[PDB]
Amino acid sequence: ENLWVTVYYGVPVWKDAETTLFCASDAKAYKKHNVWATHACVPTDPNPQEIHLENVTEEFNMWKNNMVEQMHTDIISLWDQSLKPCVKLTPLCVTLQCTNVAITDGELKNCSFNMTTELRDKRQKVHALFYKLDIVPINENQNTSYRLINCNTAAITQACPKVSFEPIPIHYCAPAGFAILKCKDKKFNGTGPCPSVSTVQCTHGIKPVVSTQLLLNGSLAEEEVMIRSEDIRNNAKNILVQFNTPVQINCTRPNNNTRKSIRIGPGQWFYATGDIIGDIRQAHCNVSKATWNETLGKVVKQLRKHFGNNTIIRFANSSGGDLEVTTHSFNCGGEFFYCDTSGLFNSTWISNDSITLPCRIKQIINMWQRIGQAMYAPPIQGVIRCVSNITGLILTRDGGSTDSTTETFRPSGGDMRDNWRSELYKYKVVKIEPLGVAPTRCKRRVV
């Protein structure tokens, strides 16, 4: 009947905490120096240990998750670390005089301009092809002298040609004393109590696929397709969608471009586009209309579960923002594509003929809302073609005072973090507090 406190060291007790995670990737061997894997990420253990926690029920919140905020700052910081040593194209802001590529009734333009040479006193005139988006006319009156789009706002640096932009699986690990809780509930929505929970030291192979509008190469939701949002009632917050069946999308750049290596200084090398060899075709992606119409129908079924079992569900193209947010932007073999998705979100729902999408390309880009530094993607030699998985989406309501009679859904890409949340919805970081004090009928011996 006399109770005394006793210290237990190693009690399964944890508390919500945010710590500094680190990198971990398999032992992939090779060209290399891919930005994300870096020179050294801790190689994944030959065998990971996933330990299911019986009887455990933990509250999750993918929208207040700090793993997202950390990953975001890691991608940004990794990008800058790879641009620092590469060649900066400060002298490439010389006035450009551009002409058309002949044809009657032009996305790319043939530009001639003078560029410095190895020797300070000598100069050289070189001709290189450019895309319309990367250039603006220096007159508007108009004459026809053009300049690079970035020279007015921020400097520019050329991405090194060796580093590759292909995402590889990356595992986010937590330090000793902390742990990661994975929600294995198939039907798990955005937030809430997860009945089935397990613990792991590192996450699964998460590929840092930077996309917009459409989610590519992600992980497929099990069982039914999932509709995740922070506030379905609030139109302002985006809507994450995860497919149970992946749709296939083929993007190609049929032009047989060429790489022109023009030295612009001692050691500095600039890689310009070389006249195209062969026909002049524009890049485009294909999607099977049967699968997409089927996949889009499965989405509207889960959509009605939150907007009434019967309601008008239409789809329109992006009507807000410009440039990145209006086009399904992404990377493919080193070239940055920008596709018009009006053909995919152009339906209305109530109660082998593959779709084609126009894609334009740029070589000067400012990703992640970066203000101050632009990057020049060196031209990729040969024909480019990449087959990717479209696993998720990012939608948004139009809002307004419509009496709930009809609901409209448009794509968007407001923030880059939503891409990370599409793969970090199931994980959570907690710290282990192994000191527990409890009363027992034991007493220390006075001896």
Next chain:
Amino acid sequence: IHLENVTEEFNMWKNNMVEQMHTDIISLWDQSLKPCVKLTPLCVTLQCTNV
């Protein structure tokens, strides 16, 4: 401290101290050149005559 009775196998060719020292000299060199003056403008065309 001499280790009596000890007999150890050596291999100066598979020694990792060499590989480490090599990368240390290289990295030390670059660390000393970074703050010094870079002669990018010294690539002007030179007109040279005999002494």
Next chain:
Amino acid sequence: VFLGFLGAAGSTMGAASMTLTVQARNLLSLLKLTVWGIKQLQARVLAVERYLRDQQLLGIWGCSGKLICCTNVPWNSSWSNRNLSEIWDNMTWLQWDKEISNYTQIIYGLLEESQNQQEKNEQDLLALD
């Protein structure tokens, strides 16, 4: 019977108290200026810092070597009124830590003062002869 790290987190406190070794093991175990290197090194220092703090508390409570140690501090009923069967056969360490997290700091202070600071002086005066 081993379930793994934190396997008994949903079990009763009595069942979890049997596998404290499991949590004890996995509780500690040209330019390297990469973003990963700075994160890793800072993560490693954070892990040993938390481990040494808990081992520090066990030290000042005279319980360094053991996972289960008994003390001299009596259980003040204001902390919890629950009987032994209700505590050890009806509650998990999680919901227990939540019920007593309020008085943990007070309990830790009594745990370092009441015994091991009194015990050591009395141990010298006892083995003094």
Next chain:
Amino acid sequence: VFLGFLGAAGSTMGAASMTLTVQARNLLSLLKLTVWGIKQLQARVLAVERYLRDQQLLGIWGCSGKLICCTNVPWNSSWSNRNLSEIWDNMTWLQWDKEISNYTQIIYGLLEESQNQQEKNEQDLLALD
């Protein structure tokens, strides 16, 4: 008689077991971004990390304070069939560690489970009255 750090590495296991204190002592003891600074700081963190791991094993085996500790685990003959005189007066710790490095992981698991995880619960039920 002191020979120095690792002096008895070629001596018999019995002779080496007498100077374990020697190995125990020397086992732990504008911009600073120099290549040496990064190496040093990373080296210092590596030293304390290895030391704390061995002290962690001694902790979960209930042998924290001692250099020589006895256990409850019986010596399974499949590990080594050698008698005491042959082990302690004919072998060095090096060639011993090579002969038993095969079953070390199994032995470490039995060492943390068999006694100190059983010993602590039985210690509470014994001092329970």
Next chain:
Amino acid sequence: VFLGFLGAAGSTMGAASMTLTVQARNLLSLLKLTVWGIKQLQARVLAVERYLRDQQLLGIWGCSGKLICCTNVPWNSSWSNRNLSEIWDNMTWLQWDKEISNYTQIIYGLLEESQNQQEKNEQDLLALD
């Protein structure tokens, strides 16, 4: 009665010896390359390095768990000739450490050798039967 960290630094050695827990507690507890970050991380590694060194000495003296431990080493009078009342009721730990800082290294060597290196072998030969 608590005065705080180092509160009894000017008190007699006997009075200061009562609050050793106070000193024991507070004894351990895009680019992060800022001058502060390098200083902080290097400061944190320095703190755990000093703590582990003192805990290392307590380990090799068989006094790991305790703040007050008795040994087998007799007090050689050449170190200090002062009686117990004069030492513990007339001197502070500061002026004591100054009077004995001269022979501290010799005393530490006798403290690790005389008992715990002899004690552990005799403990095995005693519990050998």
